[PDB]
Amino acid sequence: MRLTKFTDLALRSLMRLAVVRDGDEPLATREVAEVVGVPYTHAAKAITRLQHLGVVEARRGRGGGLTLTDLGRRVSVGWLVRELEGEAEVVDCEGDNPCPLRGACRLRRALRDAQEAFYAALDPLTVTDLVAAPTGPVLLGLTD
Amino acid sequence: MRLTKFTDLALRSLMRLAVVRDGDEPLATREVAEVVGVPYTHAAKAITRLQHLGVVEARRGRGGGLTLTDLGRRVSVGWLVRELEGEAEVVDCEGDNPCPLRGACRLRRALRDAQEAFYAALDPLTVTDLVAAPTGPVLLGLTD
DNA sequence: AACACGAATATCATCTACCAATT
DNA sequence: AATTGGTAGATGATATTCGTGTT
Ligand code: SF4
Ligand code: SF4
């Protein structure tokens, strides 16, 4: 059981954008992707996703890059992981070869509850929490 | 975020073995794999794993198949999912391209706690619970 | 001088098949 | 008449790339 590199990459991007100095300069996607150490092209897809979600402002030209939106700073990590991962079932009951235990599986209820426990354990935290010490100092130091 | 078909397949096998009538006849791996609808060869690897864990008795010849061990009926689903999935991190921080936020990532602590919440939501249930109504009746009906 | 949107290419983690060795 | 242990082919999900179209 593992989170997509898409989701973790997008959260890296959100954190980098969250440590930015208030009104220093908008960040180009390349510089964020290189600071957090991910391929630029994957980061750009994550940026388009985050922009659709409303957490990241992506100025498109004439001077301008990436800004953390008001929303971006107060949204919870649980909501972000739900929207970036897609809350898809933790098991593929109705795949190409569906399980005969559909419609009367207590394991499916159990795994439903466990996945909700995961997401709810993420639900309190915001992105400002994720960039508190010692993470914030590290991200800032990494800009050189 | 998805559970391996190995783990879900093995839990299907455990459930099928749990509904077996007390001293009816030991189950061949083929008949279990076909009742629960998984490829036989994958099921055999899961069976070897379960036997190493001590939950499944696999008589090797001269007449004999699969039995749920005393342990098998009282073990928790959380323990089973831990041993079959391997408690590997839900993110690959030290992969081929390690994250620069190792050693000072609050997201890693958050995801650690969320994964523990998952496993602990599974920790109460046993395998006898998973085959209670309506699952047990369905598994039994499926034997024809 | 950047971000967005859609079509492949690559990759790798697991799904799966298989042969030989017991028993 | 079955289960076990090591070896690759299969696969499909996603990690990644890229070209064109805005802006
Ligand atoms: S055993 Fe239950 S939870 Fe697992 S794949 Fe089948 S229906 Fe889904
Ligand atoms: S951002 Fe944190 S949790 Fe994510 S891969 Fe990097 S160190 Fe791990």
Numbering used by the authors:
A (entry chain A), B (entry chain B): 1 to 144
What does the original paper state about this entry?
The 23 bp hmpA1 operator fragment has a B-DNA conformation. The double helix runs almost straight through the central 11 bp region and bends at its extremes around α-helix 3 of each of the NsrR subunits. Minimal MiG distances are observed for the + 4 and −7 phosphates, which respectively interact with the His42 and His52 imidazole groups. Most of the ScNsrR contacts are made with the phosphate backbone of the hmpA1 operator. The His42-Nδ1 and His52-Nε2 atoms interact with the respective 5’-phosphate groups of nucleotides +4 and −7 in opposite strands. The 58–61 and 66 wing residues bind edge-on to the MiG, with Arg60 making the most contacts to the DNA. There are few structural changes in [4Fe-4S]-ScNsrR upon its binding to the hmpA1 operator.
Several transcription factors of the Rrf2 family use an iron-sulfur cluster to regulate DNA binding through effectors such as nitric oxide (NO), cellular redox status and iron levels. [4Fe-4S]-NsrR from Streptomyces coelicolor (ScNsrR) modulates expression of three different genes via reaction and complex formation with variable amounts of NO, which results in detoxification of this gas. The principal regulatory target of this TF is, in most organisms, the hmp gene, which encodes a flavohemoglobin that converts NO to nitrate (NO3−) or nitrous oxide (N2O) under aerobic or anaerobic conditions, respectively.
